[PDB]
């Protein structure tokens, strides 16, 4: 039926948390259980934007639930979140997270992801699957996976001493992962209880919302997170100290959680170990332009070759790299075709190289302020005169 | 159930003991027993408020309230105070209040003031074990945590005579300790007995009360130490004196009363 | 409905009245002993209705007998009191009836006592005087 007129119900809602619309989307795959609440295909992604559809595809006490209030309780981003089944063994249970195409035809799994694109368009500038990557087996596959998207992939160590966690972080070179240590402890509406969050979400959630106003140039280490208590292994940072263990994790390039309760993250590099892609701002303005280039140049990836067709988005690539110049995320440019691999037996298979070459705001890691207490300002003041 | 109306109850309290909030946090490690009054797990911090989160975290007869309540009448502070069990000799005594990372993740003893930080937004720029700053063994490790943390580790001398604790901060040119050597008596609220109190808490929450009003440069030298008798050892000031007993002790970097 | 609350009949249908119109219904315990109404009032669990159980008496303009008022309206017009310069979100807790002599059934409230009449009541969720 229906109503005319006014209806007040009496309802039992809460904490309007409101924060500005992000754009990077984020993958996710986590468990879940698939009863008749939650409204959807365990292995297919669906596509979310706000708390609604992550509590009508998915159950209330899901762990997709509880890793998308993580992230929507950050900024309102776009996740694309491909469940899987709740399996007994770890051993099992990593084998539904990596998945594959070992169905008849279709994907499953991390493997889904892929599937954003050509779906929603929405193609993953994110990865993380919380809680199901202290495995080896799943940021193995999360990081070849990331490579494929040109993502970057967020894990996170186990939650055991301080010397387990570095032991981990050495199984990785890979220039596209970025590691949160300590295990966020979220309160969950009066549960008189803090539960261990994996603080994968959160960290892929601070990436969204400081994609949207700060630019996708600024490095994402310094800046809050929101609903988080006092975390898992207390990790400070001492200044002067060579053992704390903020410091004795930046070093095995593992972010963290630094100040009260986990106010902020700590995290500037990526899990590299070649010197130029250390940090997380050159290996995400690298992969964040050169689809804002494609972007604004899908019109060039197939057309008939004019004489002008070298000329003009050689005009349109430059045109485009002063308006990031404009915002500042690059300093000064080049961009050129290249005089040397541009022949006309190129030109008949359609091959045409042009040469981009900018660089990055380096990011302002350890500003250093070196004092003296001197008596030098004694002498002319506190005299009679 | 419940009540409606007003309820008047005699009650056992008194003697509101007022004092100014003070910004300053001090750490704080002392023994305990963790029986079923005291709601504080032994080898982790809890972050104190008042004289009421001093009694209902540890006990009302435990070290760490007896040396809560020496900071509570002087400086409404805030203390990061993580106890230890109380052991049976005296050298692993001392080095339960070290601790270190001897658990399987986690920490125990002084270690674990660093957690003052990431836990409670309190670091300690205090550091005080009310009795245990006699040995070597705790003092040093406290300039081993006073270093890290920047802060100023407040000790105590023994009970000794005058000259053995003279040679007792000759070990130390450690530039962040602060040494206080004659130990308050204290009453006790009708006990009719002067308990040696260490005299390390209540040098601690001089500090947070002239952090306040006095800022934190001004010299914390003159000033008063509220709930306390005549101490343990009478150490005068004559002047001109070159043989009294607190020239005699400045001289040695030792602060006194 | 003065008098007509003590009933299980009325005071279901006024619970089933008051929810239709978001009202609260004021209703009374019998001119029973005290447990008597401790035990009318387990029957509801009705989150609007509002329980006063001793009966005023009043004198009524030189009559000389007490007659036993319901205590229904007298209750009822304390809120409409209250509602105009204390506001309604203002507890019609402490608050004066007037036209009222000594009522029919003697509630005290003795401080700190856990046996006391009217803090009997309260705890079965029942106004008093």
Same mark, same amino acid.
């Given at each position: 039926?229906f109503?005319h007129?006014? *209806?007040?119900?009496?309802?039992?809602?809460?904490?309007?948390?409101?924060?500005?619309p992000?754009?990077?989307?984020?993958?996710?795959?986590?468990?879940?259980?698939?009863?008749?609440?939650?409204?959807? #295909?365990p292995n297919?992604?669906?596509?979310?934007?706000?708390?609604?559809?992550?509590?009508a595809?998915?159950?209330?006490?899901?762990?997709?639930?509880?890793?998308?209030?993580?992230?929507? =309780?950050?900024?309102?981003?776009?996740?694309?979140?491909?469940?899987?089944?709740?399996?007994?063994?770890?051993?099992?249970?990593?084998?539904?997270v990596?998945?594959?195409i070992?169905?008849?035809?279709?994907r499953?799994?991390?493997?889904?992801?892929?599937?954003? #694109?050509?779906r929603?368009?929405?193609? !993953?500038?994110?990865?993380?699957?919380?809680?199901?990557?202290?495995?080896?087996?799943?940021?193995?596959?999360?990081?070849?996976?990331? &490579?494929?998207?040109?993502?970057?992939?967020?894990?996170?160590? !186990?939650?055991?001493?301080? &010397?387990?966690?570095?032991?981990?972080?050495?199984?990785?070179?890979? #220039?596209?992962?970025?590691? /949160?240590? !300590?295990?966020?402890? /979220?309160?969950?509406?009066?549960?008189?209880?803090a539960?261990?969050?994996p603080?994968?979400?959160?960290?892929?959630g601070?990436?969204?919302?400081?994609?949207?106003?700060?630019?996708f140039?600024?490095?994402?280490?310094?800046?809050?997170?929101?609903?988080?208590?006092? *975390?898992?292994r207390?990790?400070?940072?001492?200044?002067?100290?060579?053992?704390?263990?903020?410091?004795?994790?930046?070093?095995?390039?593992?972010?963290?959680?630094?100040?009260?309760?986990?106010?902020?993250?700590?995290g500037?590099?990526?899990?590299?170990?070649?010197? #130029?892609?250390?940090?997380?701002?050159?290996?995400?303005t690298?992969?964040?332009?050169?689809?804002?280039?494609?972007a604004?140049?899908k019109?060039?990836?197939?057309?008939g070759? *004019?004489?002008?067709?070298?000329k003009d988005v050689?005009?349109?690539?430059?045109?485009?790299?002063?308006?990031l110049?404009?915002?500042?995320?690059?300093?000064?440019?080049?961009?050129?075709?290249?005089?040397?691999? =541009?022949?006309?037996?190129?030109?008949?298979?359609?091959?045409?190289?042009?040469?981009i070459?900018? *660089?990055?705001?380096?990011?302002a &890691?350890?500003?250093n302020?070196? /004092?003296?207490?001197?008596?030098?300002?004694?002498?002319?003041?506190?005299?009679?005169?």
């Open positions: 039926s109503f007129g006014v *209806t007040v119900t009496n309802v039992d809602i809460g904490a309007r948390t409101i924060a500005l992000a754009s990077s989307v984020i993958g996710l795959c986590d468990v879940f259980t698939p009863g008749a609440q939650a409204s959807a #295909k297919v992604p669906v596509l979310l934007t706000s708390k609604k559809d992550a509590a595809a998915f159950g209330i006490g899901s762990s997709i639930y509880l890793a998308c209030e993580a992230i929507y =309780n950050r900024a309102q981003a776009v996740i694309v979140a491909v469940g899987v089944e709740t399996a007994e063994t770890p051993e099992a249970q990593a084998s539904a990596i998945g594959g070992s169905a008849a035809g279709e499953t799994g991390l493997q889904a992801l892929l599937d954003g #694109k050509s929603f368009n929405a193609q !993953p500038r994110l990865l993380v699957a919380p809680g199901h990557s202290a495995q080896q087996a799943v940021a193995t596959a999360m990081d070849g996976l990331a &490579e494929k998207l040109r993502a970057i992939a967020i894990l996170d160590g !186990p939650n055991s001493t301080d &010397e387990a966690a570095v032991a981990y972080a050495k199984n990785f070179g890979s #220039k596209r992962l970025f590691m /949160v240590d !300590p295990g966020v402890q /979220v309160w969950d509406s009066a549960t008189n209880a539960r261990n969050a603080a994968s979400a959160y960290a892929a601070l990436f969204a919302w400081t994609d949207a106003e700060y630019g140039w600024s490095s994402p280490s310094n800046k809050e997170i929101k609903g988080v208590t006092g *975390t898992s207390p990790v400070e940072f001492l200044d002067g100290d060579e053992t704390c263990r903020a410091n004795l994790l930046n070093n095995a390039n593992i972010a963290t959680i630094i100040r009260d309760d986990g106010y902020r993250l700590w500037n590099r990526t899990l590299s170990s070649d010197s #130029k892609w250390a940090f997380v701002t050159r290996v995400r690298m992969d964040l332009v050169m689809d804002a280039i494609l604004g140049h019109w060039a990836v197939d057309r070759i *004019t004489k002008t067709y070298v050689t005009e349109g690539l430059r045109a485009f790299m002063r308006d110049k404009n915002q500042g995320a690059v300093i000064n440019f080049e961009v050129y075709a290249d005089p040397d691999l =541009n022949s006309a037996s190129q030109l008949a298979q359609g091959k045409v190289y042009w040469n070459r900018f *660089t990055d705001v380096p990011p &890691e350890n500003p302020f070196r /004092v003296e207490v001197t008596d030098q300002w004694l002498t002319e003041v506190l005299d009679v005169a």
